[PDB]
Amino acid sequence: PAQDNSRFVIRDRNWHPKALTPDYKTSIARSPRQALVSIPQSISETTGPNFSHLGFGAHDHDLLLNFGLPIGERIIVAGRVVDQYGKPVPNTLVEMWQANAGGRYRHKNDRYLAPLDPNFGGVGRCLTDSDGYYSFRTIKPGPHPWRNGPNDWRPAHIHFGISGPSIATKLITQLYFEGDPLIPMCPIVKSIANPEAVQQLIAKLDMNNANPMDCLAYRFDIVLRGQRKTHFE
Amino acid sequence: PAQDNSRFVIRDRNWHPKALTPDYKTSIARSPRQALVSIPQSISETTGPNFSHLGFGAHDHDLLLNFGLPIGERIIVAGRVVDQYGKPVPNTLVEMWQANAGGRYRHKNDRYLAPLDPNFGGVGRCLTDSDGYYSFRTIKPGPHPWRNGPNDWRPAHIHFGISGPSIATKLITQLYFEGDPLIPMCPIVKSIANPEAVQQLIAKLDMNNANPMDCLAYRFDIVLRGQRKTHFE
Amino acid sequence: PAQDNSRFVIRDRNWHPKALTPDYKTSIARSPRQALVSIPQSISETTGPNFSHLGFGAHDHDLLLNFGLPIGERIIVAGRVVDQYGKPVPNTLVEMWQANAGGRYRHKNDRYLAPLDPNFGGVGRCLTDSDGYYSFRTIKPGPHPWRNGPNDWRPAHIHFGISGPSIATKLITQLYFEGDPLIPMCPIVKSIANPEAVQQLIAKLDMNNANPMDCLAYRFDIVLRGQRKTHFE
Amino acid sequence: PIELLPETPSQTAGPYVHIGLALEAAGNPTRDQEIWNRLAKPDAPGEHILLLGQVYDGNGHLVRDSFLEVWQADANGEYQDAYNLENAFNSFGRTATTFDAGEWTLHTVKPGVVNNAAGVPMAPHINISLFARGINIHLHTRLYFDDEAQANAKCPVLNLIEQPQRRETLIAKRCEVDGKTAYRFDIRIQGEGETVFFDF
Amino acid sequence: PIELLPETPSQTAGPYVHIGLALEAAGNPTRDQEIWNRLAKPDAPGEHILLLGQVYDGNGHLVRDSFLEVWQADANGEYQDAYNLENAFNSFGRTATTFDAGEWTLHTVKPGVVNNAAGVPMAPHINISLFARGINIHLHTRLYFDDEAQANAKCPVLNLIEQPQRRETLIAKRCEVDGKTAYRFDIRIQGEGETVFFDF
Amino acid sequence: PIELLPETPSQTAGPYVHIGLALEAAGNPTRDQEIWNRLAKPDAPGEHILLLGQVYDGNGHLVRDSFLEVWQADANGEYQDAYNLENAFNSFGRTATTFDAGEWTLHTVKPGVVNNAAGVPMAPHINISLFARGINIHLHTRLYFDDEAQANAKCPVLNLIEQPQRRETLIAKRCEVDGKTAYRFDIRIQGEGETVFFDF
Amino acid sequence: PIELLPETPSQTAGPYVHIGLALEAAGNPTRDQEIWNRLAKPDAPGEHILLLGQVYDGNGHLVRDSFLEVWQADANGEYQDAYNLENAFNSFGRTATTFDAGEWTLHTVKPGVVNNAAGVPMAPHINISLFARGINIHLHTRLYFDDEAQANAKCPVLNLIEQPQRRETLIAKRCEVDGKTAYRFDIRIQGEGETVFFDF
Numbered sequence A, B, C: 001p002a003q004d005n006s007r008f009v010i011r012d013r014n015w016h017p018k019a020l021t022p023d024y025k026t027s028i029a030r031s032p033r034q035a036l037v038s039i040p041q042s043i044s045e046t047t048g049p050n051f052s053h054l055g056f057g058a059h060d061h062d063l064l065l066n067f068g069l070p071i072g073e074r075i076i077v078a079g080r081v082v083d084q085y086g087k088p089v090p091n092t093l094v095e096m097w098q099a100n101a102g103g104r105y106r107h108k109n110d111r112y113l114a115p116l117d118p119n120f121g122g123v124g125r126c127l128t129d130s131d132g133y134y135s136f137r138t139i140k141p142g143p144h145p146w147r148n149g150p151n152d153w154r155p156a157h158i159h160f161g162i163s164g165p166s167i168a169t170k171l172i173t174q175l176y177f178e179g180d181p182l183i184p185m186c187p188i189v190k191s192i193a194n195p196e197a198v199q200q201l202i203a204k205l206d207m208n209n210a211n212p213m214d215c216l217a218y219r220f221d222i223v224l225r226g227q228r229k230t231h232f233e
Numbered sequence D, E, F, G: 001p002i003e004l005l006p007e008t009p010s011q012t013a014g015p016y017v018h019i020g021l022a023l024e025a026a027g028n029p030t031r032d033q034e035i036w037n038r039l040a041k042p043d044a045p046g047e048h049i050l051l052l053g054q055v056y057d058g059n060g061h062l063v064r065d066s067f068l069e070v071w072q073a074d075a076n077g078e079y080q081d082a083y084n085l086e087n088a089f090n091s092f093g094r095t096a097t098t099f100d101a102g103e104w105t106l107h108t109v110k111p112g113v114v115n116n117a118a119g120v121p122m123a124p125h126i127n128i129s130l131f132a133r134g135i136n137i138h139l140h141t142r143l144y145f146d147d148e149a150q151a152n153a154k155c156p157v158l159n160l161i162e163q164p165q166r167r168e169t170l171i172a173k174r175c176e177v178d179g180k181t182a183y184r185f186d187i188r189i190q191g192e193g194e195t196v197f198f199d200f
C-alpha cells in the first residue's frame, strides 16, 4: 500500500481563480461563504491512485479514430507534465474532453444549433511516459455561445484532468489556443486575476511537431505542485 | 454606354506585393522579367461592367444554405467597400471562395486528406448596397498544407474578388483572421513587403455584429483606388 | 542496416544564407534559378553513415603534430554538438581544415605570397564523445586576400564539416574568431541576412580551457537539425 | 525569496464534465475500462456499505451536474494505490449527480483507522473532491460516520474545526437501503449548514 | 505630401480560383446566372469572331490554371457597361485555361474604334486581365488584330512601346476554326517573346 | 509559437575543400583510412557499375572544384550505416572534380528498391549532396537509371516533380567504359536543363 | 476586435429624482403635460386593472424613494409608441413610491400577447425598470399574471429562468381594490424571495 513519504508545496490561492468571481454567474451560488479549514498533510492527502495498470484501448488518445473521419482542423496536442521543482511526472493519467469543430458537445443538454459530427466523440485519455510526456490527436474545437452575459462566447478550448502523484496534486483545467481574440473577453478566463497565470493556459503552435501535408501541432505543458521529502518532522 | 469621366489614383506598386517573391516558389516562373509599360488612362481603362442587373439567387451570399448544415464555426463576414477618398462604392460585385472547416476545397485537384463536407460548397457573391455594405454568412475555414517549403501551411483565409467602378479598380485579395499565428509564417502573406499593408488584410472580430447564441462576426473593409473627376485635361 | 524511425525539423532557409548573394561573386553563376522541390522524408533522407568504426590516427585531431613545431598562436578549439532540442550528438564525425598563421593554404591553387610553414598541414578530424564533445589543437589561422572585390579579405577562419545522424543533418560551415574586425566586411559572412545568425559562427575566447604558459582556447558549439520520433504517420 | 515554477491554474470542470469523466452517466458509449463508483467487489473483506447523497447550492437547489472523486483506506486502514479493475478493492473511485439522478451512490467498505503524521489515529473517513460548473477550483472534504462517535471525538482533524456545530456537517447519517447498511452524506456548498471544506 | 487611405493589397488568386469565378470550368454545379465566355449572341451586330490562346510560363510550360477577364467595345466602338444575360452583346466576359482545356476561348465580335483622352483613335483592341496561382497582382495586356495593320501603326498606345519587336507580342494572328473567323493570342508571361503588360 | 535553438548556419566549403575532405585529389599525403569513391569491393554482391559525370555552372563552364557525397542502399535495398573499410560494401562515399580531373567517378553497385514512409517503393536511386566555392548551402539531388523506365514511371518522388521535362534531368544515361557497365550523370546548376534539386 | 464609442455610464437617480420625473409626487407644481401613472382612459378597450406594489431592500425595509417606468402592449397585443395624452391608451407610463406613499399604483389594461423574435408567443407581461438612490444602474424586470398559468407555463422568457422557485417572483397576485380587479406585484431587491432581474 501507499506510504506517507512526501510533502506538497502549499497551493497559492491568489494564483488560482477565487471561488466567487461574479461575472461568471454560476459561481455566485456555488462558492462557500466560510473560510476553508487548513489541515496538516497526512497519508490521506499525500497519496493517490496509480493508473499504470488500467487497460487502455489502442485509440484511447486518438479522437480522429476513437468514435469516416471527423470534419475540422487536424491537430496533435502534446506536452509534458512536470512538478514545481521541474521533475517529470511519469505514468500519470491525463484525461481530456472537448466540443466538435462547430463548438457542439456530444451531450444531451447541448442544444446549440451547430450540428453533431457523426464521426466525432470528443473524449480522450493518455498515461504519461517515463519522461512525463503525453500526446493526443484531435480536431481543433470551435468557440461556443453560453448563457452568461447576453452575448458570451467561450474561446475554443479543451478540458483537461491530471492525476499526479496524489489527491493533493489532482487538477482540472482548460487549454486555450494562441492568438484567440475571444480569450480576454471570457469571464471564466477572467476568474484568474494574474494575467501571468492566464499565459500558462495558452497552448502554443508547434510547427516542429507537425506532420507536413497532414496535421498541425500545439504544445501545452502542465506544472503540478512541487513534491519534496519530509524533513526534521 | 460608359463614358470616360474619371481618373483613378495611380497604384502604389511598392504597397502591393511585387511579381517576383521567390519564397513563394510558383512566382519564380510566373513573373515578367521586362518592366510594365505605363500608359495614360482612356475610356478603355476607366470604365467597367455594372452588375446591378445580374439575377442573384436568394442564398448567393449564404454559404450555410447555398450548397443539413455544414460543420464548423458559424460566422458572418461583413464590411464596406470604399475608395481612397473614403467614398462608398455602391452596387459593386463582391465574390468569395474558401475551404471547409478542415481546410479542404471542393475541387478535383484538392487531394488533402481532410474530408469534404456534404453540405458545404464554399462559393458566395453579393452586390454592395447603396452605402457600400456587403455581408456573407459562412463557416470559418481551416488552414491547409500546400507544397511550397516542406512544412508550409496557409493561415485560415477567404479569397475575395471586387469589381469596383472600372477595370482599373478590379482587385483579387485574401482575408486572414485576427490573431492567427500562421500569418507571419506565410510566404504568400510575406509577398507583401510592408507590415502596415499586411494589417489591412486581417479581419477583426466584431462582437457587435454577432447573433447571440448563433454566430460570431468578422469585419473586413476594402479600399479601392481613389476616383476623381478629370481637370484641366 | 539503418531504419526509418526519426524525422528532422525542416530547415529554415531564411536563417541559412540564400543561394544568390551577388556580392559573393562566384555565387552568381552557381545558384539554381528554379525553386528547390520539397519532398517528404523517407529512409533515404533520415539515415546516414556512422563513423564509429573508422580507424583514426593518434594525432588526427592535433595539427601541431599531424604534419619541428608550426609557427603561430597555439590554441585549442573545443565545443559540443547538440541538436535543436538540446540533445547531445555522440560519436559524430567532425572534420576541419584551415590556412597557416600567415593565411596560406597547403594547396596548389593557393598563390598568396605568405610562405608555407614546413611543419603545418592544416587538416583535422575528431569523432565526438559520448557527451557530444570534440576538441582540436592547432594554431590560429591568419586572414587572406581573395579575388572578389578589389580589396577583399577573409576574416581568420576554420572550415568545418559535421556529419550528424543522417544526410538530412550534414552541414558545412565556417568558424570566425571573437572580435575580428574583418568579420562585418566579408561578403561570405554577409551571405547570411540575419545578424543573430552571424553570431552563431563566432568562437568565444575560453580562458577556463586554456593551458597556462602553453596555449589559449576557443569554444565553438554546433547545433544540428532537431531529431524527433515519428508519430501518427 | 525562492520561487519555484507556478502551478498551472485551475478552471471549472464545466457543464459537460460527464462526457470526459462519467461516460455512462452522460449516456454515452463507455470504453472497456472505466473508473467508477464500485470500489469493492462482493468478496472484498470488510463491512460492505452503500454511500449516497445530494449536493445543494447556496439557494438550496440541487446540483444536478456535479462530479465527485473519492479516496479511502481498505478495512485494514491501508491505502491501495495500484488501481486495477481485477482488484477485489480499489481505494479510488468516481461518482456523479445528473439531471436524471440528483443523488450519487458509491459501493464500498468501511475504511479502517489511519494515523496522522504525528502518529495520532484519525477516525474512519473518506476523502472527497467535488467538481462542477460554477466551481473554479475543486472543493475538498471528508466523510465521517455517525456510528463512530467514540473515534470522532478524538480525531485530530475534526478537532481542528474551531466550532463544534460545524463538525457535524462532516457526519454521514447511518440508515438502510433495501436492508443494507447505508450512510447519507449531503453537501451544502454555501449558506445555512454549509459543509466544511479543507485546504492542504 | 497628402496621403489618402492605402488601397487594399492584392494577393494571388490561388490554385482554386475556378470554384469562385469559373464554376463550369471547375466542374461544380453552376448558379442560374454566370458571367462567362460568350459576349455576343448570334444576333449581335458586327463580325462574329472566335478568340483562343494558350498561356506560357517562364519555362515554356502551359499554365493550366489561369483565369482571364476581358473588356471591349461593341461593333460601333461603344462600351456597354450594363451587364445582362438578356443582352445581344455584353462588353465584359470571363474565360479560363484548365487541366482539361489548356486553351481558352471567347465568342464575341470585332470591336469598333474608340478615341483616347486626347481625342486620337486607338486601333481595335480587347483589354485583358490575367490571374493565376504564382501571380501576386494581376497582369494587364491588350489584344490587337493582324488584319488591322494600318490602324495598329497609328495607335497611340501601341506607339508608347519603345521597341517595335515587343509591339508584335500584342497582335492576334488570324485563322479559321470550323470555317469561322478566329484569331490566336498566346500569352508568354516570362522570357523569350514575353508579352507586353501595362500599368495604368 | 514554440521556437527551438537555431541550427548553426551553413557556409560555402570554399576553394580548398579538397585539403580537408579529398586529400588525394588535393595532391596531399593521405591518412591511414580515408572516405572515398570505392563503395563496393570486387566481391560485393550486385551489379557492379561505374558512375561518372561533369558539373556545369550557369554559363555552361565546368566546375573543377566540386565535392560530392553519396548515400545509397546495397543490392538488397538495405542501407549499411556502419562505415568500415573492411566492408565489401559501404552505403556512403565521397568524390570530386579537380583542375586535374574535371569529371568525377564512383565505383559501386546498383542499389535495390526501398519503400517511402507511406510504404510505396521508390525506383532505385542514389542520394547526392554537392558542395563547392560559390554554393552557400549544399544542393541535394537524386540519380536514377535510364534502364529502369518501369520503376521510374511509378516513383512517388519522381512523380512529385510537376513538369515531366524536369524529371529527365535526374536520369543517368547508360554506357560502357572499358567494356564495363557505366552510367553518366551530368549536373547543371543553373540555366538550360538545370538539374532538379530537393529540399527535405 | 472592433470597438464602438463607449456608452455613457449610468449613475444612480439620487434621492430627489421625484423633482425631475415625478413632480406631483415631489409635491411641486406640475407643467401642462406630464407623463404619469394612468396608461388607459376609462373608455379604452380591454380589461381595466389596477396594479400596486411595494419595494423592499435587503433588510426587509420599504424603499420609499423609488421611481418606476413601465412598457406594455395594448389589449390587442400591440405597442403604441406614439405618446399622447389625448390617446385612450399609452403603452408607457411612470409611477413612484414616496415617504407619503410607500406603495405605487398604475391604472392600465391587461396586455395582449406578443411573439418573441422566433415567433413564439410570450405570456401577457408588463416591462418594468426601477430606479432609486443606492441603485447605480436601473434594474429590469417583468410582471406576469397569476390567472394566466397556462400561458406562463409556456413563456419562452419565463422558461429561461433555471429555477422554478425563481419564476414565482415574477407572478403578480390577483386581488380586488374597492371591489375592482387589481394585482399586487411586490419587488424584493435583495435576499429572501429576491426578484429576478434581467439583462438585455
Ligand SMILES: [Fe+3]
Residues within 6 Å of the ligand: A157, A159, D014, D016
Ligand atoms: Fe467546455
Ligand SMILES: [Fe+3]
Residues within 6 Å of the ligand: B098, B154, B157, B159, E014, E016
Ligand atoms: Fe485558398
Ligand SMILES: [Fe+3]
Residues within 6 Å of the ligand: C098, C099, C157, C159, F014, F016
Ligand atoms: Fe578558407
Ligand SMILES: [Fe+3]
Residues within 6 Å of the ligand: G014, G016
Ligand atoms: Fe443630486
